[PDB]
Amino acid sequence: NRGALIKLVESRYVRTDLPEFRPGDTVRVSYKVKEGNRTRIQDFEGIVIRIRRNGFNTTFTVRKVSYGVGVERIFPLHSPLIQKIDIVQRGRARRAKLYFIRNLSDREIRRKLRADRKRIDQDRAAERAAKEEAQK
RNA sequence: UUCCCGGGCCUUGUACACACCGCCCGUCACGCCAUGGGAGCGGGCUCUACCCGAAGUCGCCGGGAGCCUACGGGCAGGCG
Ligand SMILES: [Mg+2]
Ligand SMILES: [Mg+2]
Ligand SMILES: [Mg+2]
Ligand SMILES: [Mg+2]
Ligand SMILES: [Mg+2]
Ligand SMILES: [Mg+2]
Numbered sequence: 001n002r003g004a005l006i007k008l009v010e011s012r013y014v015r016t017d018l019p020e021f022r023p024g025d026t027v028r029v030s031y032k033v034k035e036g037n038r039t040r041i042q043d044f045e046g047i048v049i050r051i052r053r054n055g056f057n058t059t060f061t062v063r064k065v066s067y068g069v070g071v072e073r074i075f076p077l078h079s080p081l082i083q084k085i086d087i088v089q090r091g092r093a094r095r096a097k098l099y100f101i102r103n104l105s106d107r108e109i110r111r112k113l114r115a116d117r118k119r120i121d122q123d124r125a126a127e128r129a130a131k132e133e134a135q136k
Numbered sequence: 137u138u139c140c141c142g143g144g145c146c147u148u149g150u151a152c153a154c155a156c157c158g159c160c161c162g163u164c165a166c167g168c169c170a171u172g173g174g175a176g177c178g179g180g181c182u183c184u185a186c187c188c189g190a191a192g193u194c195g196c197c198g199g200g201a202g203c204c205u206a207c208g209g210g211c212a213g214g215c216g
Contacts, residue, residue: 106188106189107188107189110214110215111215114214115214117199117200117201118200120200120201121200121201124201124202125201
């Protein structure tokens, strides 16, 4: 027995070091790349378009426009190749997956996605709190 | 003395004048050139309508928040 508990044992690859976010709010993920036997940390930053929750190997995809072409990247949420991920802004999604933005991509999405104050306000307030409460 | 040939004088018509064995016209054939049309093909300029929209000035907001304050202000920022 413990069919899932065994496969759930299987991960020493879970990682707690990355931030909370949901679809709709924009983030920036730094990712190890090769680029000809050298090594670089490339950043990729756009709206997170969706999140697939499987526990370990959940994955989340990020969309942005780059030099006049939309791009989506799909990252494994536990990937050993993610150095860090910063949330660069929060936004109010209204539904789980937003693919609908692909056929907007214009000003109409900054109207559809207006920033989520509740989670913004609780970020600052969480950052003031942890800042004040570490030192003294 | 009508007719054929040549000739003389006057006259008349002429686009002939190396002068009627003159001049000249239009198709057709050939060569060269330029040009119209032509299923279309390419390009330039332009107009109309609608979508998206940089930088920017302008206008409204500056609030569940920021910063400075000379705080019933200004700034970042947001929207048009
Ligand atoms: Mg079990
Ligand atoms: Mg005569
Ligand atoms: Mg003759
Ligand atoms: Mg002659
Ligand atoms: Mg022609
Ligand atoms: Mg517009």
